[PDB]
Write an enzyme that holds these catalytic residues in place. Structure first.
Site, PDB file in Angstrom:
ATOM      1  N   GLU A  98     -51.811 -61.707   6.284  1.00 29.25           N
ATOM      2  CA  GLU A  98     -51.717 -62.623   7.142  1.00 29.25           C
ATOM      3  C   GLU A  98     -52.318 -62.220   8.561  1.00 29.25           C
ATOM      4  O   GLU A  98     -53.254 -62.793   9.255  1.00 29.25           O
ATOM      5  CB  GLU A  98     -50.544 -63.463   7.351  1.00 29.25           C
ATOM      6  CG  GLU A  98     -49.948 -64.122   6.191  1.00 29.25           C
ATOM      7  CD  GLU A  98     -49.664 -65.455   6.331  1.00 29.25           C
ATOM      8  OE1 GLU A  98     -50.602 -66.184   6.629  1.00 29.25           O
ATOM      9  OE2 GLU A  98     -48.593 -65.848   6.001  1.00 29.25           O
ATOM     10  N   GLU A 118     -47.022 -65.057  -1.827  1.00 24.12           N
ATOM     11  CA  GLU A 118     -46.018 -66.132  -1.421  1.00 24.12           C
ATOM     12  C   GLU A 118     -45.549 -67.196  -2.273  1.00 24.12           C
ATOM     13  O   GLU A 118     -44.258 -67.423  -2.635  1.00 24.12           O
ATOM     14  CB  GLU A 118     -46.509 -66.700  -0.101  1.00 24.12           C
ATOM     15  CG  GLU A 118     -45.995 -65.866   1.163  1.00 24.12           C
ATOM     16  CD  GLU A 118     -46.992 -64.677   1.292  1.00 24.12           C
ATOM     17  OE1 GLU A 118     -48.136 -64.672   0.656  1.00 24.12           O
ATOM     18  OE2 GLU A 118     -46.795 -63.789   2.385  1.00 24.12           O
TER      19      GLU A 118
END
Lengths: 244, 241, 243
Positions: A98, A118
């Site tokens: 990220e 995720e």
């Protein structure tokens, strides 16, 4: 001899940038001749395509926690004002991947992997990846990474342009340092404003985006550093930039 | 043992994510230290670049009108524009390249925006456009470092659409132009306009722009002919109507 | 039925089924797509969709209310579930337009990809002029639409139009494998992730991140998120419910 040659071959026009003594560098003259050529090409319905090329062996060398703290730390609500070089020395997954999207220049170890797993645990990569990833690499691979949660190899990451280099095992930080050295020799106001113009113009309506670009370009043009760049080249000496 | 090591070597700061026993997974403390590092890096004028890396095996597992038109800065050409990049394409040449549509690179061509190396920026559209056209990280690298791409790299990152043998870029560009010339002129013109004007705008607005430019093409003489010629096994005779 | 709709538990497989005409988009096929998308969005038991063509081609070429057309072609509609393209052969025109609304894309080694519309005095106005340059490098999106010439599978992979190139005849196999991975993921998380990715688009980053945060929140507070942490502590497969 004209600085922009204009040749009509049926429905095609060929434009040739023609200043061999400067390897076809743009001049005010050539740019005026460009404006005129675009008008001709736009107005004549019989012109169906235009080709742009350079004379000789050059094309154009061209010139002449607190939520504030969290958001900032993750570079989610903050954009670093200086260039950030990722030396990706190994696995780069989840939050690491990220944050990678807010790095500028990216060097991958041969054995690094890149992933956002995720969804496999019933979470989402909501630290900017869903906004950003598709902006930075091809849509289908951004989608695939996020919806499957499966990682990319370094070769794949390089194929899809998530990173800019793949280097031999253990050398990512070496290569990153070499890139940094190149950056620290560049004009610091130029580098800061260039990054800010690139980021803040975004993918906004081009007219608005160009206004953002101009606002950050003007101070650079009028800077001490810009004049030093020229005066240096050449008082036959290297440039000493100060960021003003 | 600080969870984020901060090391300064001159105008470079090196940040090392440092919890190797957890493969440098982000923690509360590390994020906090990250924020403090960003603040330090932004405030200290002597820091000109930052490097981020991980400890051990892992990284982190979590008349002005004339110049504007000439450079295609404030003007978009209504016809396709093919770049036959026969050699070095640097600075202004590489800025204007972003407003060409279809791009052929000689194997010996290079592509670069060295402006920052002389205390300048590529402000003829490159900061707006380059990241929209090629992968963000290579666009950033090109502008911030000022260093050029090879033809192979330019093709890899999609700055160009073809790489060809030495001296043959114009030959290939002519072949491409020939194909375009044989295509429907209204269709080609309206397609380019729709591609450019829709931009990266909210999809609802972008599609409305596309639909506006598509509608006159669908009902055109050239569309009837184009589809007849294809069915009849013959060259389309287009008029732009 | 010019579009076969079949189920393998949580996976739905859509097959364009007029091989004699290389699965060209017809009025009826677009209508049948529109109804299929409606079903897929409504059926909570469907976690992934795969799209493919019968015979040698995927989809080449091509009375209805404009809303049927708009939904069927995925022009005005975005599927709420992941859509995997199993591109088994030629993917031209309408088929390559719809491709841009698929999420994950597997190409047969012998598939080709193109928008030949301008060669016939048409434009690819089912979203391609908007979308193609957003998904692949601008210059290649421009070249495809302005010349009308196709890409090979390896070129489409080079330019990121597709995510995989696989051995001849194995695109549906690989598509099912990817679908199986997706079906094992959190369905609320996958749905909201797709919605955040699409809805945030290329908008001003402050607005885009607010869109992302709003869709992220119900995921973070979900039963599935808790179950995911339990399953990735206990070292077992998660049993998700989409809540």
């Amino acid at each position: 001899a004209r600085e922009l040659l204009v040749e009509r071959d049926g429905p095609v026009v060929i434009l040739t940038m023609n200043r061999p003594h400067r390897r076809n560098a743009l001049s005010t003259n050539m740019v005026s001749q460009f404006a005129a050529a675009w008008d001709e090409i736009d107005h004549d319905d019989g012109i169906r395509a235009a080709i742009l090329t350079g004379a000789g062996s050059a094309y154009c060398v061209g010139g002449d926690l607190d939520p504030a703290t969290i958001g900032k730390g993750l570079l989610l609500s903050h954009t670093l004002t200086k260039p950030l070089i990722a030396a990706v020395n190994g696995a780069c997954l989840g939050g690491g991947c990220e944050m990678l999207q807010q790095t500028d220049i990216r060097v991958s170890d041969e054995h690094a992997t890149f992933g956002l797993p995720e969804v496999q645990r019933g979470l989402v990569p909501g630290a900017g990846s869903m906004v950003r990833l598709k902006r930075q690499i091809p849509y289908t691979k951004a989608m695939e990474m996020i919806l499957t949660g499966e990682p990319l190899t370094a070769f794949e990451a390089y194929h899809f342009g998530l990173v800019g280099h793949v280097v031999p095992a253990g050398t990512a930080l070496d290569k990153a340092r070499s890139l940094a050295d190149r950056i620290v020799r560049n004009g610091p106001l130029a580098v800061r404003n260039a990054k800010e113009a690139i980021v803040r113009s975004g993918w906004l309506a081009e007219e608005d985006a160009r206004a953002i670009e101009a606002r950050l370009t003007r101070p650079v043009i009028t800077s001490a550093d810009a004049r030093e760049g020229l005066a240096a080249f050449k008082e036959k000496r290297e440039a000493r930039f100060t960021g003003r």
